[PDB]
A and B are shown apart, each in its own frame.
Chain A
Amino acid sequence: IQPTDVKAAAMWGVAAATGGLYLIQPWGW
């Protein structure tokens, strides 16, 4: 409801990591 709001909302945190290394490959860190 409100759990499914965040249980969705933290995988856009991760859709954004599939995206955050998609072009830059930030390497050393």
Chain B
Amino acid sequence: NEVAESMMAFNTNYKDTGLFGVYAVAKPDCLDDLSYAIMYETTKLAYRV
């Protein structure tokens, strides 16, 4: 759908905590359909693999 310039998933570890997520770069009129697609596929990992 060309809704971004670039997309990247990250995963950082520390001694007691960490961070898991997604980083994205896009044009200002694409931010609704991009945010739907990011949240739809992360939550699907808890349901349907």
Contacts and interface: CB of A to CB of B under 8 A. Distances in A.
Interface in A1-27: 1-2, 4-5
Contacts of A1: 47-49
Contacts of A2: 48
Interface residues of B, number: 3
A1 B47 CA distance: 6
Contacts of B48: 1-2, 4-5
Nearest to A2: B48
A1 B44 CA distance: 10
A5 B49 CA distance: 11
What 3 pairs across the A-B complex have the smallest Cβ distances?
A1-B48, A1-B49, A5-B48
